Design a protein around this ligand. Structure first.
Ligand SMILES: *[C@@H]1O[C@H](CO)[C@@H](O)[C@H](O)[C@H]1NC(C)=O
Ligand SMILES: *[C@@H]1O[C@H](CO)[C@@H](O)[C@H](O)[C@H]1NC(C)=O
Ligand SMILES: *[C@@H]1O[C@H](CO)[C@@H](O)[C@H](O)[C@H]1NC(C)=O
Ligand SMILES: *[C@@H]1O[C@H](CO)[C@@H](O)[C@H](O)[C@H]1NC(C)=O
Ligand SMILES: *[C@@H]1O[C@H](CO)[C@@H](O)[C@H](O)[C@H]1NC(C)=O
Ligand SMILES: *[C@@H]1O[C@H](CO)[C@@H](O)[C@H](O)[C@H]1NC(C)=O
Ligand SMILES: *[C@@H]1O[C@H](CO)[C@@H](O)[C@H](O)[C@H]1NC(C)=O
Ligand SMILES: *[C@@H]1O[C@H](CO)[C@@H](O)[C@H](O)[C@H]1NC(C)=O
Ligand SMILES: *[C@@H]1O[C@H](CO)[C@@H](O)[C@H](O)[C@H]1NC(C)=O
Ligand SMILES: *[C@@H]1O[C@H](CO)[C@@H](O)[C@H](O)[C@H]1NC(C)=O
Ligand SMILES: *[C@@H]1O[C@H](CO)[C@@H](O)[C@H](O)[C@H]1NC(C)=O
Ligand SMILES: *[C@@H]1O[C@H](CO)[C@@H](O)[C@H](O)[C@H]1NC(C)=O
Lengths: 367, 206, 413, 99, 49
């Protein structure tokens, strides 16, 4: 309406700064998406033959029959579901997001932590997992002696993700709430066009039809006052909401760098248990991490001591803890029961027996 | 005698197609699970508006009369099914003290095994009729189920109503009240389910 | 001008809003029915003395009055409350035609609240009366040799009539010392008297036949109304439209929807109307808004060049080199079949740059070089050498400490 | 005058609301800068890509108008060869793993 | 007051979205408290000695 447009000009810059605020939101959504996924310099791709030593990534790698999404990414896309208002496309299409998660994933499988530090350097996957076990204080032979079981436990645990996300949407409540909050905001902004704000009618041409020139302008100024307060409320609410999504995108960009591109020693950051590695999967308006962790699972009580005294000398374990099976003494690594005989190699001396509270008497073998 | 209305007495409130959607509306409706009067023919009050229904296989009902006096001093509705069409007149009838059958006028119009159901209301000088018909197997009562009454006529009568009576083998009368309802439209744009929002706390939650 | 600047840096800037204007107006209404019988009423068989003026009532019909002034057959024509050419649009609760015979000198009197012995003593009209006097000279019919005495009017009353006071009282008007006794004489007269119409009378004394149309609108809704026009049904173009009083601006299109027999309008989830039934040929039309969207200008920055390309955001190029992106219609840039890093963003994987003869080009952005990592189950890569690298990272820490004096910003002095 | 008061008051309420939301974005950045000075400058972080790309050696703070600039020094591995490799080697019937 | 309330309805959804906003603040305080303290699945207890 031209008759309303001429009144709206009396309010000055208000209408221009609402577009500038929403443009600042819109530009940032591409920055949030870029800084999560674009952490990889090259689109790394998988070898044609899947010789990863028994670990089975086929559920999380790309499927050419799928957009080129993985099987788990196709589940994640199924479980999430105009009066001068416009919606704009994202800069990266869902196919480009899935090509970035493919590159991050194929780099991680074929080259470990190395592609984050510089160029991707290949290493066999069973050896990569053996050096991810050293990162949690479990000696690498604990992997090679159990490699078939460790692979079965991993393959089984990925199978439970397919069943979980096939059978319930409930885990995606964080992504679905972000769709629902933007829908509830626009439904409210549109329904506020029907409100009177004290004008004789909310239909603008009905005000112009019922009333004389100067009498109508005093009523149109009520629709302008209410519709301007309605749009200012929506833009202020989107600014507060975008600051919460940006805090989540900065956390997602940090879990990309520290969980996927490396191995975090930060407790409960990359899931519960001691962290081994994690895999990114795309989802509508977000990211999903599959955090793979070592959890210790059966235990026994053992008698223990801070040190053992040989001929006057107190011996302490280098890397381990002393334990007894009731009649013999051994040293073990801490996070997995593997007893070794106590020797001049497994231990170091420091002073006489008498200083240490709770030392015990046992023979140290000297090979 | 009286009978439970169950979920019956909903009608299409407006001339609008809506599809795959739940619509909230405030209007005169018969409240869910209200008791209604049962008959096997007094002048009844009209109140704000009426739900009228019968169980039938014989066509023994033939019409209705509506007005303020329902008698002589002022214009009054006569509605009759002539066994071929509906016939309506609004005359100042000096009518008899009871119904009779073949077994001044400002305006006129022309069109057990079943339930026949109807709603009558008068707003801003327009008299509204809505109806539905279905086969039934139950003998004594309004059948527990759901279907919506559709508009028949929308007549600009300019006449007041506060009392009415039946012209005529079993029938029911209930009264509309101002209520809020949530109405479910399916993909064909028919109403297929409804909630009476004030019925109970679960209905408020829905 | 958008930037308030003479230098423009490299980028994409929103300068304006595009909007497809309504090209024409569509109007649609029901098939017309039940025309009111005015041309037959103006040819009625009978007329009345004006003290007992005769009314015919009209209801439940559509009205045309244009014949009553487009035909020069009527020797006098006047209208009140509404202009004669506007009546054909309007609605009334009741309509009436009021009929009588009087001399030509008294037809001028018949007007809202006005004076004159026919208005004042026979057919008084209120100050708000809406209606028309249509009248014709009837000296060929109503006049008689030796005079016609069959037509009467009230010549005497103690006071003037109220609106429509159809007074048919008949007692002798006493005008002096003579007692009345129901008989005329010196200063005693019958209150009704006659024009005595002779065919040799002059035009002011000659009889006119009169029909006065009288119109009435009340708290009870209309029973008589004017007819309405309708247009061709222009699908696939931006128009203003009106169906049965539902107004809007949009593009009308065919639809698969099946409105129930009583349903006329279709609504979206936000109650916004999105379909209609045409009242004349009962197809269901989907309604869609006429296209709009931001206009953005892509520029390599005026430091490098004055060339620009423009993006009509979300617009299809049919509605405005020209190229259709999924972000909207792009104008002034070449679609290039290569891919490069994103220089200036557009959307949906499209970016634009200025490159080699140089022109603005639009291309699908490339995410990085492809790389097959040389994986094998017994091969490892170990670095022979290293580089120390120094990286700059920049973080904002504090704003400028503004404070504003609220009563001096708002008022001051 | 009450129209000028009503409009100028709403114009100032809008500015103060934008500054409250904008100052919270700068506080999030000032808390990140305070964290990088503790973890990158005062120490040696092992958090990947936190203190620049490559393996972190150290970083140096430089001031700037309304902010801070960190010069992050990192080791990047630069030239490589392929080699044949094995998880363990077998000697006198027993398996040796690299210490 | 009903004479005021029937005027406040002419402003439409402003009241509903304020009650919804403060309910959003209020539920989030119980979330914050569970994020911090409820990091433990069992109530561990120290021995008598
Ligand atoms: C991986 O799993 C699929 C079925 O999900 C199976 O056909 C395939 O043989 C498995 N490959 C490996 C290396 O275990
Ligand atoms: C360890 O010792 C305690 C006390 O005798 C006993 O309750 C517990 O079952 C034992 N085993 C483990 C795994 O804690
Ligand atoms: C403890 O270790 C020795 C190692 O030779 C073994 O013979 C003995 O059976 C073990 N168990 C107990 C309960 O002593
Ligand atoms: C544990 O406590 C007992 C009893 O107080 C004490 O004799 C002993 O020295 C302590 N230390 C060890 C290693 O048993
Ligand atoms: C441990 O050995 C020393 C001699 O080497 C002896 O004096 C001491 O009593 C022994 N302690 C126990 C608990 O046997
Ligand atoms: C009856 O109809 C007349 C029509 O003018 C209206 O004024 C009046 O309010 C109606 N109701 C009653 C109770 O008279
Ligand atoms: C809509 O009506 C058609 C028949 O007109 C029917 O085939 C279709 O199944 C209906 N849709 C639904 C959802 O029932
Ligand atoms: C309206 O009249 C035209 C011309 O006779 C006819 O084609 C059309 O079908 C009519 N429409 C209705 C709904 O009667
Ligand atoms: C653009 O509009 C034309 C005309 O309606 C249509 O043929 C074409 O498919 C449209 N293309 C897109 C991508 O919208
Ligand atoms: C781009 O490449 C495709 C595939 O070779 C071809 O169909 C198309 O004609 C080429 N040219 C343009 C300008 O798209
Ligand atoms: C290692 O790189 C440096 C330059 O960074 C070069 O001077 C040196 O010769 C290189 N050494 C080898 C063994 O490649
Ligand atoms: C390692 O070997 C493969 C296979 O011969 C080869 O493609 C690759 O380029 C080699 N990489 C390096 C760093 O020499």
């Amino acid at each position: 309406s031209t008759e309303c447009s001429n009144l709206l000009l009396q309010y000055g810059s208000f209408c221009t700064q609402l577009n500038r605020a929403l443009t600042g939101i819109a530009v940032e959504q591409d920055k949030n998406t870029q800084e999560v996924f674009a952490q990889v310099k090259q689109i790394y791709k998988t070898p044609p033959i899947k010789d990863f030593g028994g670990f089975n990534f086929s559920q999380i790698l790309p499927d050419p029959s799928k957009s080129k999404r993985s099987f788990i990414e196709d589940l994640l896309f199924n479980k999430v579901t105009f009066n001068g208002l416009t919606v704009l496309p994202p800069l990266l299409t869902d196919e480009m997001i899935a090509q970035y998660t493919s590159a991050l994933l194929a780099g991680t499988i074929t080259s470990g932590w190395t592609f984050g530090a510089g160029a991707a350097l290949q290493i066999p996957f069973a050896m990569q997992m053996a050096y991810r076990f050293n990162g949690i204080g479990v000696t690498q032979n604990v992997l090679y002696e159990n490699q078939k079981l460790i692979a079965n436990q991993f393959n089984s645990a990925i199978g439970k993700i397919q069943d979980s996300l096939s059978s319930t949407a409930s885990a995606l409540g964080k992504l679905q709430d972000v769709v629902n909050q933007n829908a509830q905001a626009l439904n409210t902004l549109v329904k506020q066009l029907s409100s009177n704000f004290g004008a004789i009618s909310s239909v603008l041409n009905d005000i112009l039809a019922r009333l004389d020139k100067v009498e109508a302008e005093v009523q149109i100024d009520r629709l302008i006052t209410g519709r301007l307060q309605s749009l200012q409320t929506y833009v202020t609410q989107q600014l507060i909401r975008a600051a919460e999504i940006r805090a989540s995108a900065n956390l997602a960009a940090t879990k990309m760098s520290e969980c996927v591109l490396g191995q975090s020693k930060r407790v409960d950051f990359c899931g519960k248990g001691y962290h081994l590695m994690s895999f990114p999967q795309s989802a509508p308006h977000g990211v999903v991490f599959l955090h793979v962790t070592y959890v210790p699972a059966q235990e026994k009580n053992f008698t223990t001591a801070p040190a053992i005294c040989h001929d006057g000398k107190a011996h302490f374990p280098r890397e381990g803890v002393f334990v007894s099976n009731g009649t013999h003494w051994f040293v073990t690594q801490r996070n997995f029961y593997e007893p070794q005989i106590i020797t001049t190699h497994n231990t170091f001396v420091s002073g006489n027996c008498d200083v240490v509270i709770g030392i015990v008497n046992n023979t140290v073998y000297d090979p | 005698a009286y009978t439970n209305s169950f979920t019956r007495g909903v009608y299409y409130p407006d001339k609008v197609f809506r599809s795959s959607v739940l619509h909230s509306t405030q209007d005169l409706f018969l409240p869910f699970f209200s008791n209604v009067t049962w008959f096997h023919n007094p002048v009844l009050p009209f109140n704000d508006g009426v739900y009228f229904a019968s169980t039938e296989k014989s066509n023994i009902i033939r019409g209705w009369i509506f007005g303020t006096t329902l008698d002589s001093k002022t214009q009054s509705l006569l509605i009759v099914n002539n066994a071929t069409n509906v016939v309506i007149k609004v005359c100042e009838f000096q009518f008899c003290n009871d119904p009779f059958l073949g077994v001044n006028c400002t305006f006129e119009y022309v069109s057990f095994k079943n339930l026949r159901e109807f709603v009558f209301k008068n707003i801003d000088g327009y008299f509204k009729i809505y109806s539905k018909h279905t086969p039934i197997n139950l003998v004594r009562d309004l059948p527990q189920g759901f279907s919506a009454l559709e508009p028949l006529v929308d007549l600009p009568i300019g006449i007041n109503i506060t009392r009415f009576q039946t012209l005529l083998a079993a029938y029911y009368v209930g009264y509309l009240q101002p209520r809020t309802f949530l109405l479910k439209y399916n993909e064909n744009g028919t109403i297929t389910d409804a909630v009476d929002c004030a019925l109970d706390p679960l209905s408020e939650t829905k | 001008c958008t930037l308030k600047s003479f230098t423009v840096e490299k980028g994409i800037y929103q300068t304006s809003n595009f909007r497809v204007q309504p090209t024409e107006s569509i109007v649609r209404f029901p098939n017309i029915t039940n025309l009111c019988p005015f041309g037959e009423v103006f040819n009625a068989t009978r007329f009345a003395s004006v003290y007992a003026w005769n009314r015919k009532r009209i209801s439940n019909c559509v009205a045309d009055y244009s014949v009553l002034y487009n035909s020069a057959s009527f020797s006098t024509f006047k209208c009140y409350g509404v202009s004669p050419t506007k009546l054909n649009d309007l609605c009334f609760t009741n309509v009436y035609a009021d009929s009588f015979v009087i001399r030509g000198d008294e037809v001028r009197q018949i007007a809202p609240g006005q004076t004159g012995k026919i208005a004042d003593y026979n057919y008084k009209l209120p100050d708000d009366f809406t209606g028309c006097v249509i009248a014709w000279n009837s000296n060929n019919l109503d006049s008689k040799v030796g005079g016609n005495y069959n037509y009467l009017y009230r010549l005497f009353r103690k006071s003037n009539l109220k609106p429509f006071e159809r007074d048919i009282s008949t007692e002798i008007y006493q005008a002096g010392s003579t007692p009345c006794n129901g008989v005329e004489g010196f200063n005693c007269y019958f209150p009704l008297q006659s024009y005595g119409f002779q065919p040799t009378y002059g035009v002011g004394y000659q009889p006119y036949r009169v029909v006065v149309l009288s119109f009435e609108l009340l708290h009870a809704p209309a029973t008589v109304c004017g007819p309405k026009k309708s247009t061709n049904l222009v699908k696939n173009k931006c128009v203003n439209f009106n169906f049965n009083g539902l107004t809007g601006t949009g593009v009308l299109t065919e639809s698969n929807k099946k409105f129930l027999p009583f349903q006329q309008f279709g609504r979206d989830i936000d109650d916004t109307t999105d379909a209609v039934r045409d009242p004349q040929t009962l197809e269901i039309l989907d309604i869609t808004p006429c296209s709009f969207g931001g206009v953005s200008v892509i520029t390599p920055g005026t430091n490098t060049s004055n060339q620009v390309a423009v993006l009509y955001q979300g617009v299809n190029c049919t509605e405005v080199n020209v190229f259709q992106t999924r972000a909207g219609c792009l104008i002034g840039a070449e679609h290039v079949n290569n891919s490069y890093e994103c220089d200036i963003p557009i959307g949906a994987g499209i970016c634009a740059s200025y490159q080699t003869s140089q022109s603005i080009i639009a291309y699908t952005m490339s995410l990085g070089a492809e790389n097959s990592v040389a994986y094998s189950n017994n091969s490892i890569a170990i670095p022979i050498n290293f580089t120390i690298s120094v990286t700059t990272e920049i973080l904002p820490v504090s704003m400028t400490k503004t404070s504003v004096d609220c009563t001096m910003y708002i008022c001051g002095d």
